[PDB]
Design a protein around this ligand. Structure first.
Ligand SMILES: CC(C)(COP(=O)(O)OP(=O)(O)OC[C@H]1O[C@@H](n2cnc3c(N)ncnc32)[C@H](O)[C@@H]1OP(=O)(O)O)[C@@H](O)C(=O)NCCC(=O)NCCS
Ligand SMILES: [Cl-]
Ligand SMILES: [Cl-]
Ligand SMILES: [Cl-]
Ligand SMILES: [Cl-]
Ligand SMILES: [Cl-]
Ligand SMILES: [Cl-]
Lengths: 74, 720, 159, 4
């Protein structure tokens, strides 16, 4: 499972304080800073789009991927 | 938090995805495995495309971290905040001043018009009134006000869809994905809604300062909805534009009497924090304190409609050369002009086709009468010249970069076909634009003081070639006038006969069809020769001033500070890069610039230096007066008109603006002579002081002067 | 005060973080972390830092300049100065000047034909620095930095 | 400086 397989796929990145980012992974570095495109910001009842967003390592709480999507990557 | 829907909604955020796998432990160890320099990405993807990225938990780049007050979060469009009459007026006042900050102050759309919670409410229901407060002022009076401004922005959108000016520097239209489709009502509905809410204010028995201001506010919004008329119907009527000026003037006097405070949270950065936003958060800029911006907007649009009254090609030519010269017009008027000038039916001002309008300019300039690709391409070139006149002060000079190389290509193509009448006009437009493009750089502080000689002598060099071309054009026209005059001389000597009828037949034909234009063009070339000699003499005065400064050792024609990277020749070629591909007139060599400077610079010393310096200053003071006299002569002909028979200026539509331009040009002329006296008196006395001061030269703009010719002012150099 | 000028060490991440820490305090336009990784990761050799060897913290960057180079149009290489900042307590000592020199000298070694940069019309400190080195104004952009003011496009021809 |  190389990191190059994950790029271009939708990741569910939960921010550190009750924020959920849903967007495609564009780039990732050695310090684990994420660059996501077509980001949808979900928190509670509301939801909005944010375009291209960068997520630092400290701001991340967890990263999750849809299981059907994960198996087609292999 | 304590909201019920946010609690249940937290369960539905993951509902769309059936199964989720935590990959955080996988990412950490894999990113820990990568080398620190490497970045995993799509090889096709360019990392430059990631510079516009937002960053979470960064206050300057995260829209979710915007701090709001309790009132800004708790603001409800359905609550009718007390007092109703005073708050609606305060809300409506804020919206119109938000419109001014958006358009006149070049502020972003989300900060101004879309910051209003009522504006976001009305537009949101249209995509699918919006609020029902139970009060007549919020539901109907304010509901009409919000609709008018919303209808105004939709019309502003259509003006920007024309691609006339440049987005987000001339005008920001960041509507945050708002597309009202066809759901937004037509003009008739918006005006009637404002008129019905207006008659409610008229029927109100109570009388207050807040009611009177709200009476004018609805009237002002009605006039803004009528701005569309100048584009859809091309109406030249100033009725609604005069009402907008008069109502704003009445409101400006009311502002000192009353103090308006809108409901807290009515206008806030709330929309940036909750609606879809792909841009960093931005504070709300300070709003205007008066309605003076509406007066400026209405006057500029009134000026745009004046070009419809033009009868000749020269009147349209001079209108484009003056309507946006003295100061940058409002962006609404700067967009409206090319759309009003170049109309929908592919006609210029509804009178001329694209080819007819071009053939007018050649006929009125060359005084000669004769649909191929060369004429068609030249007609499109002329229209792009007109459209560039309405650009801002920076884009105005940038537009010539494209024109100069295209005019030169167009002239060379005319010469290959030996169509010399069109070739001459293309050469006039090119050489005129070369001079304009060069002198505009002084207005924009592009040239440093040490480059002043290079640019001022180059424009002088160009102005000498333009005067030569113009004087030969008048000599060719002078001989055509004498040819018709010689027929009248020959007819008097001739006896009545068949051959006298042939000459009488051709004399009247030439007198009826050719004589009037030759006279009108002869007088028009008199104005051009006077203006170019004024522009030529001013450049020469600037060159003489620079030479006096170098003679005393205050400035050089290169950068005085040493640097171990470039050289003078490379920097000089870069400055004159746009003029490199133009063959006529040829760009002088780097050596010609240097040798010409030594002709002006005084290398003598002592009494011999004082003699040559006096001749230089005596020329400056004398030529300034000769320039003032030529400017004075032009200003009289502009006041008198074109039918006097001596000069033809074609400035009927821009008479006041053209007079203001030459008066500013006269101020700079007088200022150049005063400054040369100061420089001589300062530096002569400074030589006497062994521990003299250290001066630096700065290019200074005279406030009421013409900024194409800045004053080379020397100032004392003090360390910081 | 003993100042040492160093090429960027890409593996040194605390040095990387101090570069962003310094630039972010003195910029009007905020930069995300991938703005820095666009410059530094792709052009590591074109970012220099200035350190004070006799200070209490020897290796901390008190100043830095960040540059890039790409072929302009087709036949010429244009070096670009994107970021330049010096600590507030260290200004007026010629630090930024030598950072620009060592950067342009590096890009000249890399066969750059010109150096380009944009700056505000109101930044008199930066304009005197570049124009004193031979830069000239080639363009004025209207409201390039929004309410900060207009901008000047500066070019220093090298070949 | 650098501005997007
Ligand atoms: C520009 C800046 C880095 C200068 O820092 P510095 O260490 O003092 O630079 P230097 O001491 O080497 O200055 C060298 C030359 O630049 C000019 N200069 C420097 N500071 C100046 C100032 N306050 N005012 C006017 N000119 C100044 C001078 O011409 C100076 O030469 P001089 O000493 O012989 O008069 C600092 O002002 C800054 O942090 N600006 C904000 C970042 C920025 O905008 N950079 C440019 C955008 S690309
Ligand atoms: Cl408010
Ligand atoms: Cl003409
Ligand atoms: Cl005419
Ligand atoms: Cl032809
Ligand atoms: Cl002029
Ligand atoms: Cl460090």
């Amino acid at each position: 499972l190389k990191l190059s397989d994950f790029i271009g796929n939708t990741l569910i990145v939960s921010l550190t304080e009750d924020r959920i980012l849903v967007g495609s992974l564009v780039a990732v570095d050695a310090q684990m800073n994420l660059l996501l495109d077509h980001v949808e910001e979900r928190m509670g009842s509301s939801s909005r789009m944010m375009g291209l967003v960068s997520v630092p390592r400290r701001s991340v709480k967890t990263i999750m991927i849809d299981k059907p999507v994960l198996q087609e990557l292999t | 938090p304590m909201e019920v829907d946010s609690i249940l909604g937290s369960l539905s955020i993951t509902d769309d995805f059936d199964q989720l796998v935590d990959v955080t432990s996988l990412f950490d160890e894999l990113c820990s495995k990568l080398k620190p320099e490497a970045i995993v990405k799509d090889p096709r993807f360019d990392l430059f495309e990631g510079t516009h990225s937002l960053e979470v938990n960064n206050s300057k780049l995260d829209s979710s971290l915007i701090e709001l007050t309790a009132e800004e979060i708790e603001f409800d469009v359905n609550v009718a905040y007390d007092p109703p009459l005073a708050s609606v007026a305060a809300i409506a006042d804020r919206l119109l001043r938000c419109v001014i900050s958006w358009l006149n102050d070049y502020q972003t759309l989300p900060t101004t018009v879309l910051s209003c919670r009522y504006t976001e409410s009305l537009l949101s229901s249209l995509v699918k009134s919006s609020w029902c407060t139970g009060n007549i002022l919020y539901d109907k009076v304010l509901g009409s006000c919000i609709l008018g401004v919303c209808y105004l922005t939709k019309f502003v959108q259509k003006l920007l869809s024309a691609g006339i000016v440049f987005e987000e520097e001339d005008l920001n239209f960041n509507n945050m994905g708002f597309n009202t489709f066809d759901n937004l009502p037509g003009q008739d509905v918006v005006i009637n809604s404002l008129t019905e809410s207006l008659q409610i204010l008229e029927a109100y028995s109570d009388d207050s300062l807040h009611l009177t201001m709200l009476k004018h506010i609805l009237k002002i919004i009605i006039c803004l909805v009528h701005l569309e008329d100048h584009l859809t119907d091309y109406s030249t009527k100033t009725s609604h534009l005069d009402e907008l000026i008069e109502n704003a003037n009445s409101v400006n006097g009311i502002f000192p009497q009353l103090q308006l405070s809108p409901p807290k949270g009515a206008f806030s950065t709330y929309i940036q924090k909750h609606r879809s936003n792909q841009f960093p958060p931005r504070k709300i800029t300070k709003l205007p304190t008066d309605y003076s911006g509406f007066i400026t907007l209405a006057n500029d649009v009134k000026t745009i409609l004046l070009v419809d009254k033009a009868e000749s090609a020269l009147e349209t030519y001079q209108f484009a050369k003056f309507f946006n010269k003295l100061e940058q017009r409002h962006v609404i008027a700067r967009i409206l002009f090319p759309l009003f000038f170049i109309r929908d039916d592919r006609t210029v001002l509804g009178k001329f086709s694209y080819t007819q309008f071009y053939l007018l300019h050649v006929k009125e300039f060359s005084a000669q009468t004769p649909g191929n690709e060369l004429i068609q391409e030249s007609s499109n070139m002329l229209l792009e010249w007109y459209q560039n006149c309405s650009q801002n002060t920076c884009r105005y000079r940038q537009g010539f970069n494209r024109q100069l190389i295209l005019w030169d290509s167009l002239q060379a193509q005319f010469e290959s076909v030996n169509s010399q009448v069109y070739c001459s006009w293309t050469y006039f437009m090119k050489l005129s634009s070369m001079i304009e493009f060069s002198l505009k750089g002084f207005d924009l502080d592009i040239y440093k003081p040490f480059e002043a000689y290079s640019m001022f002598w180059y424009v002088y060099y160009l102005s000498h070639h333009l005067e030569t071309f113009l004087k030969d054009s008048q000599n060719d026209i002078e001989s055509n006038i004498n040819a018709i005059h010689s027929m009248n001389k020959k007819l008097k000597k001739l006896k009545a006969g068949e051959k006298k009828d042939q000459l009488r037949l051709k004399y009247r034909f030439a007198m009826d069809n050719e004589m009037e234009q030759l006279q009108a063009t002869k007088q028009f070339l008199n104005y051009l020769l006077k203006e170019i000699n004024i522009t030529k003499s001013l450049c020469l005065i600037e060159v003489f001033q620079f030479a006096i400064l170098k003679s005393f050792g205050l400035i050089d024609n290169k950068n005085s500070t040493p640097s171990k990277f470039s050289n003078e020749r490379l920097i000089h070629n870069l400055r004159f890069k746009p003029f490199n591909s133009i063959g006529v007139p040829e760009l002088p060599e780097y050596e010609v610039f240097q040798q010409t400077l030594k002709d002006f610079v005084i290398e003598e010393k002592g009494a011999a230096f004082d003699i040559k310096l006096e001749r230089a200053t005596n020329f400056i003071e004398t030529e300034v007066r000769n320039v003032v006299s030529s400017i004075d002569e032009i200003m009289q002909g502009i006041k008198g008109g074109d039918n006097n028979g001596v000069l033809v200026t074609g400035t009927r539509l821009v008479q006041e603006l053209s007079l203001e331009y030459y008066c500013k040009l006269k101020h700079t002329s007088k200022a150049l002579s005063v400054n040369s006296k100061v420089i001589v008196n300062t530096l002569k006395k400074n030589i006497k002081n062994k521990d003299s001061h250290e001066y630096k030269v700065e290019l200074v703009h005279t406030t009421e002067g013409w900024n194409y010719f800045p004053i080379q002012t020397l100032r004392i150099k003090q360390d910081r | 005060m003993e100042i040492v000028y160093k090429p960027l060490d890409i593996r040194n991440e605390e040095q990387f973080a101090s570069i962003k820490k310094l630039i972010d305090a003195d910029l009007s336009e905020p930069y995300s972390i991938y703005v820095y990784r666009y410059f530094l990761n792709q052009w590591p050799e074109l970012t220099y830092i200035a350190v004070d060897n006799k200070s209490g913290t020897p290796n901390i960057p008190i100043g830095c300049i960040v540059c890039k180079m790409d072929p302009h149009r087709n036949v010429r290489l244009r070096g670009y100065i994107g970021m330049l900042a010096v600590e507030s307590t260290y200004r007026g000592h010629g630090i930024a000047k030598k950072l620009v020199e060592i950067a342009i000298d590096k890009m000249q070694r890399e066969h750059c034909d010109e150096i380009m940069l944009e700056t505000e019309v109101e930044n008199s400190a930066a304009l005197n620095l570049y124009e004193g080195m031979g830069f000239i104004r080639m363009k004025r952009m209207f409201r390039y930095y929004l309410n900060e003011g207009d901008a000047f496009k500066l070019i220093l021809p090298l070949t | 400086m650098f501005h997007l």
